[PDB]
């Protein structure tokens, strides 16, 4: 939606581009000035 | 004093559920209200005297009927009808 | 209907292209009546609306007789000029290429 979706998290191989799997995510959206 | 008139002033009909009648025919007829001192008892003849028939002059609205039902059942000649029959 | 004999004997140019213009005017008159025969045979006035059917046949005939396109040169050499030979009695098919009397 124009801004950036992000996963605030409460040895990762790079080269597989993929979100880390986690139960009960903490998704938030902030624009990319912050 | 005594009585010798009534000057009925009909303004507009609202939801006449005109049944068996092609939607078109309804809005292509001559909607007219006819007054009658009860007694008469709808004496056919009276329903023609050009002194009791206030015909419409606007365009009638052959709306559907309740909708969300007759719209799925199609056909349904039944149509809520109205018209600004303005006259005494 | 004996204007074809005059076309051969006319020496000057103003009398030659006037007789030629008259024969081609009578030619498109005859092909309009011939197409009108088709539109009365095929009973089209029951389905298509009449007066505008007359108008679209007229503007089709004028665009195909007067024209600056290849359909004009093909229509002349195949339909108009052979019909001139049958009603006016002179074989002028091949020498009256449409840029000779194309004037209005």
């Amino acid at each position: 939606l124009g801004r950036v979706l992000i996963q605030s998290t409460d040895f990762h191989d790079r080269f597989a581009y993929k979100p880390d799997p986690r139960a009960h995510p903490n998704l938030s959206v902030d624009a990319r000035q912050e | 004093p005594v009585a010798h008139a009534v000057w009925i002033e009909i303004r507009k009909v609202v939801n006449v559920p005109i049944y068996g009648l092609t939607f078109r025919q309804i809005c292509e007829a001559e909607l007219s209200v006819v007054a009658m001192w009860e007694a008469e008892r709808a004496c056919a003849a009276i329903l023609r005297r050009k002194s009791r028939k206030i015909t419409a002059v606007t365009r009638c609205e052959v709306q559907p009927l309740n909708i969300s039902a007759i719209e799925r059942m199609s056909g349904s000649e039944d149509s809520l009808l109205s018209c600004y029959i303005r006259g005494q | 209907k004996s204007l074809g004999l005059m076309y051969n004997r006319f020496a000057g140019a103003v009398f030659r292209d006037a007789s030629l213009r008259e024969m081609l005017a009578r030619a498109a008159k005859h092909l309009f009546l011939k197409q009108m025969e088709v539109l009365v045979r095929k009973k089209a006035y029951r389905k298509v609306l009449w007066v505008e059917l007359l108008q679209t046949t007229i503007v089709a005939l004028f665009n195909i007789v007067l024209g600056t396109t290849e359909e004009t040169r093909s229509f002349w050499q195949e339909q108009l000029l052979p019909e001139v030979a049958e009603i006016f009695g002179v074989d002028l098919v091949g020498t009256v290429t449409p840029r000779s009397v194309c004037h209005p």
Binding site: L1, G2, L5, P25, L27, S28 | - | -
Partner: protein
């Protein structure tokens, strides 16, 4: 998943205001000083054509019904809902015009 959109009325290009967009010379702006010492499309003519050009295509955006709350974004429990499964959110439609940017 992206649902596309192909409509009949995007932005009908015969509207009387789109003449102001195509040639911004006939916008009826008066002048106080001499008119001939102005470039024939003035900067107020050209810029007003640009605003009047944004406004029509912003109306043409199919997301414009809820556009005030598109800017504020989804809050937490809506973002989890879009995160559950690959379903068409009513906020992400497939862009097939590149007209707004």
């Amino acid at each position: 998943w992206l649902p596309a959109l192909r409509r009949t009325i995007e932005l009908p290009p015969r509207l009387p205001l789109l003449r102001f967009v195509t040639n911004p010379g006939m916008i009826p702006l008066l002048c106080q000083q001499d008119a001939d010492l102005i470039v024939s499309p003035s900067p107020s003519q050209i810029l007003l054509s640009k605003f009047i050009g944004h406004t029509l295509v912003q109306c043409a955006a199919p997301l414009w019904r809820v556009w005030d709350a598109v800017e504020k974004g989804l809050d937490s429990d809506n973002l989890l809902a879009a995160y559950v499964s690959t379903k068409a959110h009513p906020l992400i439609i497939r862009q097939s015009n590149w007209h707004l940017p």
